[PDB]
Amino acid sequence: TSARIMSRIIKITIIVVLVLLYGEHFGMSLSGLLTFGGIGGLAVGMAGKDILSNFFSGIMLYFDRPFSIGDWIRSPDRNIEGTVAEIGWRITKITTFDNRPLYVPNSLFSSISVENPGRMTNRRITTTIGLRYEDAAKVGVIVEAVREMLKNHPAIDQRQTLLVYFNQFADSSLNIMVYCFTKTTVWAEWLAAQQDVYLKIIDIVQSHGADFAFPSQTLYMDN
Template sequence: MSIDELILRFEQSPYLKDWDNSVLLITLASFLAWGIWRLAYRYLFNLTEKTRIHWDDLLLHSLKTPISTLIWCWPGTISLGLLLDDHFQTKFNWLQNSKKLMLIAIFVWILLRLVGEVERHLLVQRVHDETTVQAVSKVVRLLFIMTGLLSIMQAFGLSLKGLLTFGGVGGLVVGLAAKDLLSNFFGGLMIYFDRPFKVGDWIRSPDRQIEGTVERIGWRMTIIRTFDKRPLYVPNSVFSNIVVENPSRMLNRRIHETIGLRYQDADKMERVINDVRDMLQNHPDIDAEQTLIVNFNSFGASSLDFFIYTFTKTINWIRFHEVKQDVLLKVMAIVRQHGADVAFPTRTLMIDPGRQSPQPDQVLRGSVAETR
């Protein structure tokens, strides 16, 4: 078969009798449009890479997949309608509604992808608070989804006025039936707006057995990882009724220790205290601008006690203990430099020399008498 005969048969094909409704031409046009979009995307991508603004990159990336999907699905819907009309000899009106639904879905999809790209960009930059960024992104996503659902309902002929009126009455019923769920939802909003803690903070509550690192703040519950690596799922409504302490936001960590000297070192107490105070004021890891106290405090049962009250510059738990260890070792060295020593529990037995001691045979007879 020659090429001329192939062209003649192709021209006589029933699909090309009405070329504007031809499935074949629609498919070829879709492929051509997709190729043009790919070339345009590559050109725009190279163009946006040269700019210093990141927002054009985020917008272009959010358009990539939805536009490609629209290029193939929209002509596919038209082709499906032509095939169904040809086989069943009837009009399918639902295809028109499906096109409207597709446009709304693609538009909402683009917006959701754009919100996700912006959220990831802000989290990577670490300029804004992580919890605030996540909260705003969730609210914006919810707003776009609700707008898309209302647009779909209106496209199908539903009255928004009646829907909103029904929603007011239905919302009251749903609110009474799901008050715990709503309380957790609004508790999550209060956490986002008041920001008593954020993801990564170490929190604890003196009212409940809650202590650990915040892993995730959801709409219904907050996930806290305890220090023994167990997950703790706390409903958000709980945080509106308890006291929450956030040690991660402390400015300093406190060293408060009591040290006792022996009573025979009483004449060296003042010099030891002065040297310890000078050491703390010149220590590179001690915040001398905060309260710093080193004073003789009390007469103990077996020691003369003085106390140290100061604050470290670091708030890191591990580093704090390293600084505290260094301070205590230096205090011990200062005590020994002055010939003194740290006291330990002792007891002194006083014997009256004027009292006659019992003779050994009297003690022996008394012991025998007691045994009898």
């Protein structure tokens, strides 16, 4: 389709060949060549940017790929997520978890940090608890029961980092940092462990009479 389009590509090529042959035949004068000549390199230079660089930068990715099709590639910087679909020079298909294919320009991968959880070894499960000041005396023991359970639980990696401590003193709460790592990377398996853990842990704070806490205030009144 489209005459003018197909035409004008021949055109911007042919005249690079014409200037070349004209300064080799006549071009009297030689002087004006170099000059005209420079606007091509400079204008292509400031019209170039990413639109040209995508190909080099894509090739650099071709020498080695930090991400490899079968992985999802969160980036803290730019907002791109979900599994890497297919790799191409001008673009890079990438399915998101909403199954919409975002076409990422390749030059972006040149700059941003590009962690891929797809190559995970583990899933960190991080939580927080938070027990009323009323529960304050019993903090030492409740923490310990929770500390003990995680070791004995099958799902979590005992060898891996496993800290539970009074930690923060924050706000209206007494937040307690659960921090431990699950085995399986895979989504349903880890989530299921997490549910099992919160169900167990939730009971323990219930079990000793320490009560879970919500933001709370101190109203003052007149008579």
